[PDB]
Write a protein that binds this ligand. Structure first.
Ligand SMILES: [Ca+2]
Ligand SMILES: [Ca+2]
Lengths: 376, 376, 376
């Protein structure tokens, strides 16, 4: 059976009988008629809804943490995948792989109706990127979020605040390794690593960048992927954050992201070389410094440069201390937040040092990234 | 009549006759054929367009203020609701309830084609949240926006700049009580209240938070809903703004949001206890300080803490004045903007005090929230 | 042939035969049946997908620069236009008009399947805004982006980083004349002009605004379209940026946007009157100062005010220097970035002067706008 048909122009002056269907041959779609409306009611081709993703509560992430190693997709979630409508009318368990501490996972909704996590960010095992659609993810952290203001534990588990979906997520170039602070903005779970080009800015069990272990030079700002900066100036850390679509924290962000850490406490010892791992000679284990949001080594480990200027000024004369990119006059300090391993009682979620010019470089000054929260 | 049908895989190698319809039984949808294209043209199921909201001018809000107590939805607006397409092809009057000064209203598009406002943010009277879809809202203010630079009046009316829709709105956790400043960012209409957990940060006729009436402690940062902060430090006000997905204003934002206030004028008297209400012993009524955008008590009533540091520094020694969250060194002042009731000619949209450290607390220092503008 | 039909309520308790189609006469749509599901599967009317715009890689712009005067739309792009699905399954050349140095172009996808650029931002020549849909655009710059750190050339060409689409774009009120810096945020290609109300903030070959050529007073802040500010205070430039949904750069943004300029070099001579044109008596042509991202006159031409305070403070007394909008106490300097024509070796992507209060006005202090990056 072939329906009556015509071009869009032919349809424009045509009114079909009530409940008659015609085919618009310019559009290759069905047109429903009501006996009254010239041109009828053309229907949508499926490919105009490709990538549809509809949640019942758009103000919250699509997933709920149900236990340390379990999570569900929320009732009322509708997902287009590979030409099909896949939906969930009740909270539905996400099928999990083996989960490994300090690893990011992608959540896929698949055209067979299943929802599954995988460490692979292209496709989950057994599927392709056509049959499995990446819709979100989470961080499987090396320890719990802080329940109060005494840090967290060392039991690996899903960080509920690290759950993201394609419409509830960091406004950074990659969402991995970040956590949502107070529903307001996202912070890197880990201090910036040296190898951030390969690892992203926030990765577990990597060498921390600082004045004596400078980060790789950004490949968006003249780097070749091998060269590192000459030192740990604010300038270099700010440049690295920009590369990744992030920024250094301001004071309002810092006090929020670090809340839950053990206040007035520092790592001790002589160094903090590695993310999510005890410091060298540390008297407090790394988890003492986990925030409510699961920010790791949030205070008392390494100062983070901040995106705010004020405090002690440099000389009231033009000074060429920018790495060959011009001179500065009466340059205010750039903020440093959180304290470092040698800070004893001075460290905490509001610890702030306003002495250091942006050209300064020290083994206890590094960086943590933040970015805005995006709800679509 | 039952159409020929098959699975998606069966369809993949099938080319129907021109204008033939088949049914894909895996997808439960219609497939239109053109006699040429293998697999044909599958059509979209309605639930893949659930929540569709389409405006002719996406760069502007969906509604127009047509009078003090009247507004319309704009021509060209298409809204999915309860399985139906509801649209407006000409500007269409919004059906209003009784409007009460200082109250926020939700705008609903309903599956019967009507558009109506209500003080209830779940459903309008006579409907449910299934038959009525919340698409936006406005503030019915206690007085007019400023026409020039002499404040506003006390005639309750819709604030045109407070109109928001689900794709043109504050990037804060709740849009209520905010206004759009110069099309650029949103500001709280009201100074922060003590009871912000129950009221949100911006509510009419509530007790204003300050150093002598501290805000409720944020329940995202250890609060229980009853306890208040010990004082009115910058730290506490910044924490409260973060709770709500807001921040304190910077200087650029402050001068914009307060433009239209009566400059070089203060409330007078001895206190400003309540939002949108005259101060105690006030020589100027509250409306003298309304901005162009309908920001209430925009200057000359209470200083607002700002999200910027600089000016006078605290001691160049580690100082434990953060409420037990670490120490600060050479701490710059946090900005205070706008002047307060005792400011006489010093107050205004660019009044700025850079003396007070973030630990300071006074009865004339409070806060106002801002956030980014989101157009989707 | 008229299909069986009924209201939505009649459909609710009706289960059609497998592969039967009915018409819902309340919705004017087709309902597909499966012999099992009461109410069947209603299909979407086309107008619920009006404005659909779907890209294969939503993290990148929809277009690729293929040569100095050529560009393509990317494979996998699906566009709703005038009731039709228009798509591209391979990278497809954009049809170009004559291209003129320093001009912004709009890219349209048309209902005949073509994709074309035009200087007209309402419709391309030969089409209307109904048959041609504006989906993005670019800047055809007066010279190349910087390949290293020695500026660019004077060969007019598409600036690849200025490519924007309706889902990958500046979060400013108009996208024209901006470029994406490191994938992170957008900057104005040109310094602010006097006639920004008519031209926008970023336009080629216009008079640059500064203390001796003040910008037009914003019509959102009391301007009439003819009057200019009395001077070039920070306050006035910040107000202008707000008008356009922009802000002045911070230090992190400035060093990023100016990277690629010839460092420690200034224009020379006695003035830089005009955007994208040599300065008066200039010893370096304008293109010496083009950044990697195609920011023109990025350093060494005019200082830009910044959105950051610190450095040298004004008096610790209330001072009425805000243009009649209140007084300031211990007012910190507002940042100035980049150097100016008289800066010799002091200029560069990190040049920063923290001496000038926001009330100061000089012929070598102007402004450049930035804004956030939006990916939808
Ligand atoms: Ca500052
Ligand atoms: Ca700042």
């Amino acid at each position: 059976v072939q329906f009556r048909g015509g071009t869009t122009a032919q349809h424009a002056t045509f009114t079909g009988a009530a409940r008659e269907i015609t085919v618009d041959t310019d559009k290759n779609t069905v047109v429903v008629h009501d006996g009254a409306t010239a041109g009828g009611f053309p229907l949508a081709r499926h490919d105009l809804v490709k990538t549809a993703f509809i949640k019942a509560d758009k103000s919250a992430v699509a997933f709920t943490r149900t236990g340390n190693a379990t999570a569900s997709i929320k009732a009322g979630t509708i997902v287009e995948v590979n030409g099909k409508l896949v939906q969930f009318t009740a909270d539905t368990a996400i099928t999990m792989p083996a989960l490994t501490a300090g690893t990011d996972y992608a959540i896929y909704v698949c055209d067979d109706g299943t929802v599954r996590a995988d460490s692979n960010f292209s496709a989950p095992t057994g599927y392709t990127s056509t049959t499995a659609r990446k819709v979100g993810g989470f961080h499987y952290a090396p320890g719990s979020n802080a329940a109060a203001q005494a840090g967290g534990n060392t039991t690996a588990q899903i960080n509920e605040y690290s759950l993201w979906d394609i419409k509830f997520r960091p406004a950074a170039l990659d969402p991995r390794g970040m956590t949502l602070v107070a529903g307001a903005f996202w912070a890197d779970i880990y201090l910036l690593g040296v190898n951030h080009l390969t690892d992203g800015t926030s990765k577990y069990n990597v060498t921390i960048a600082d004045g004596s272990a400078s980060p790789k030079k950004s490949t968006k700002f003249g780097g070749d992927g091998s060269a590192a900066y000459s030192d740990g100036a604010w300038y270099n850390f700010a440049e690295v954050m920009t590369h990744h679509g992030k920024r250094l924290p301001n004071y309002n962000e810092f006090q929020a992201l670090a809340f839950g850490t053990t206040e007035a406490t520092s790592s001790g010892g002589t160094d903090v070389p590695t993310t999510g791992v005890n410091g060298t000679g540390a008297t407090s284990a790394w988890n003492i410094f986990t925030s409510k949001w699961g920010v790791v080594q949030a205070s008392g480990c390494l100062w983070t440069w901040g995106n705010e200027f004020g405090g002690v000024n440099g000389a009231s004369e033009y000074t060429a201390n920018t790495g060959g990119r011009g001179s500065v006059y009466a340059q205010p300090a750039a903020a440093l937040f959180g304290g470092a391993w040698n800070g004893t009682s001075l460290s905490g979620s509001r610890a702030a040092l306003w002495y250091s010019g942006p050209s300064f470089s020290f083994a206890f000054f590094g960086a943590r990234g933040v970015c805005d929260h995006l709800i679509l």
